[PDB]
Write an enzyme that holds these catalytic residues in place. Structure first.
Site, short mmCIF file in Angstrom:
data_model
loop_
_atom_site.label_atom_id
_atom_site.label_comp_id
_atom_site.label_asym_id
_atom_site.label_seq_id
_atom_site.Cartn_x
_atom_site.Cartn_y
_atom_site.Cartn_z
N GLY A 67 5.60 8.80 -8.70
CA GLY A 67 5.11 8.52 -10.03
C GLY A 67 5.31 7.08 -10.48
O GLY A 67 5.08 6.14 -9.71
N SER A 96 6.25 7.45 -2.34
CA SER A 96 6.73 6.08 -2.48
C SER A 96 8.03 5.98 -3.27
O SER A 96 9.03 5.46 -2.78
CB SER A 96 5.65 5.24 -3.16
OG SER A 96 5.06 5.95 -4.23
N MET A 97 8.03 6.50 -4.50
CA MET A 97 9.24 6.43 -5.30
C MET A 97 10.24 7.50 -4.87
O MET A 97 11.45 7.27 -4.92
CB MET A 97 8.91 6.58 -6.78
CG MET A 97 10.12 6.65 -7.71
SD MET A 97 11.37 5.39 -7.39
CE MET A 97 10.51 3.91 -7.91
N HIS A 121 3.87 3.72 0.34
CA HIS A 121 2.75 2.80 0.18
C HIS A 121 3.18 1.70 -0.78
O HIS A 121 4.35 1.64 -1.19
CB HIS A 121 1.50 3.56 -0.29
CG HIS A 121 1.69 4.29 -1.59
ND1 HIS A 121 2.34 5.50 -1.67
CD2 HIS A 121 1.29 3.99 -2.84
CE1 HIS A 121 2.34 5.92 -2.92
NE2 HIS A 121 1.72 5.01 -3.66
N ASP A 170 -0.91 3.61 3.24
CA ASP A 170 -0.17 4.86 3.31
C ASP A 170 0.28 5.12 4.74
O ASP A 170 -0.49 4.96 5.69
CB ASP A 170 -1.04 6.02 2.81
CG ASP A 170 -1.63 5.77 1.44
OD1 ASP A 170 -1.12 4.87 0.73
OD2 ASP A 170 -2.60 6.46 1.07
#
Ligand SMILES: Nc1ncnc2c1ncn2[C@@H]1O[C@H](COP(=O)(O)OP(=O)(O)OP(O)(O)=S)[C@@H](O)[C@H]1O
Lengths: 192, 183
Positions: A67, A96-97, A121, A170
């Site tokens: 997010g 990612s996070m 990413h 990605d």
């Protein structure tokens, strides 16, 4: 709906929700997208556990598609600031996070399930306005991308050049490959 | 020389539909008289005493059985209640109150009182309220049971005879309880 359970204590029986029961044992659940409300709630839980016991290990289960970055970076600084070792586990997926909070855990106490999947990413953004304003938001998001790669290399041990090439687009990493990449330490296949 | 059949026939006249309960009392009454009759200077030493616990529905006739027994019983009998008992010497009452009440019926005869029988009513009033060990002191309840333990097994409790005549005596009479039966 949330089911209710009963925890037996010396004083008497107490009714607790399933999430609050695990919170008593230094266990936090990170579900869904990371936003300002969900992130600010986890911080209060971490702080609450610090005062109760600063020497007991914390377990953080992450199952989220990622997010907002700013909401997640507040948690990263919290995990590193407090003394207890925040153990991290990846269940289902870590974007990612979600991957950044996974590798930020205590060294040697990071695990990933045999069938879990990690995806990483570059930061996403956008702006609409004058060219002068677009340059400002572009320079800012560029610093974040550079900052996120520096910290990723610190915990993973890889070089900054390697992280830059692998995070351009990605990249999905299976659970075994994550160990070879230094992102995690081991896999919790069975209970021993 | 009373016998279970003779004593039960007498009790049957005042109670009906309690065949199981009557048998227990007859054995204890017969054994208790037999126990005290024995000199105790024999192979059997420190003969055991079987106590009785009468549990039943409301108004089934429990209190009546103890009352009828005293009429036929020769040895002293006393009927106290655990409602007024308070532990740790509180204002309500002490456990020694039961013993002094027995002497009133026995006319302050120590040798004749130890061979007496005791009855207690409303014993459930001191049961914990279906809880684990309390977090505070329960003067009436868990506390009262703790005090009766040593009394039932056998011990000597201080009892002022007649309440004491005046300051002159300032003494207490030891009252053994190893032989006393409790219902
Ligand atoms: N089998 C019985 N035959 C004749 N009268 C009875 C019988 N059972 C009870 N009663 C009558 O019930 C009265 C009181 O009986 P209780 O022994 O008090 O019964 P209870 O169940 O002990 O009540 P508690 O102990 O006070 S809760 C007696 O005085 C009798 O009049």
């Amino acid at each position: 709906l949330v089911p209710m359970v009963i925890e037996q204590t010396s004083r008497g029986e107490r009714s607790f929700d399933i999430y609050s029961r695990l919170l008593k044992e230094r266990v936090i659940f990170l579900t869904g997208q990371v936003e300002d409300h969900m992130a600010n709630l986890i911080v209060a839980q971490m702080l609450f556990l610090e005062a109760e016991n600063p020497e007991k290990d914390i377990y953080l289960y992450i199952n989220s598609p990622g997010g907002v970055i700013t909401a997640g970076m507040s948690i990263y600084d919290t995990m590193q600031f407090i003394k207890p070792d925040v153990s991290t586990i990846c269940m289902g997926q870590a974007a990612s996070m979600g991957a950044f909070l996974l590798t930020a855990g205590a060294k040697g106490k990071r695990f990933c399930l045999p069938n879990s999947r990690v995806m990483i990413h570059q930061p996403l953004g956008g702006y609409q306005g004058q060219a002068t304003d677009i340059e400002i938001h572009a320079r800012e998001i560029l610093k974040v991308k550079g900052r996120m790669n520096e910290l990723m290399a610190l915990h993973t041990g890889q070089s900054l050049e390697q992280i830059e090439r692998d995070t351009e687009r990605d990249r999905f990493l299976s659970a075994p490959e994550a160990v070879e990449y230094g992102l995690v330490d081991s896999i919790l296949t069975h209970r021993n | 020389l009373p016998t279970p059949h003779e004593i039960r026939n007498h009790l049957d006249d005042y109670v009906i539909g309690q065949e199981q309960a009557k048998k227990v009392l007859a054995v204890a009454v017969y054994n208790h008289y037999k126990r005290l009759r024995n000199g105790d200077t024999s192979n059997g030493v420190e003969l055991g005493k079987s106590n009785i616990l009468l549990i039943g529905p409301t108004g089934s006739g429990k209190t009546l059985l103890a009352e009828t027994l005293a009429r036929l019983l020769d040895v002293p009998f006393t009927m106290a209640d655990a409602t007024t008992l308070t532990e740790a010497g509180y204002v309500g009452e002490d456990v020694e109150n039961i013993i002094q009440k027995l002497l009133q019926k026995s006319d302050y005869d120590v040798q004749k009182a130890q061979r007496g029988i005791v009855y207690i009513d409303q014993i459930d009033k001191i049961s914990r309220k279906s809880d684990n060990p309390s977090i505070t002191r329960d003067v009436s309840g868990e506390g009262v049971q703790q005090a009766l333990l040593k009394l039932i097994e056998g011990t000597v409790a201080a009892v002022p005879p007649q309440g004491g005549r005046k300051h002159p005596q300032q003494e207490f009479l030891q009252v053994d309880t190893s032989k006393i039966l409790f219902i």
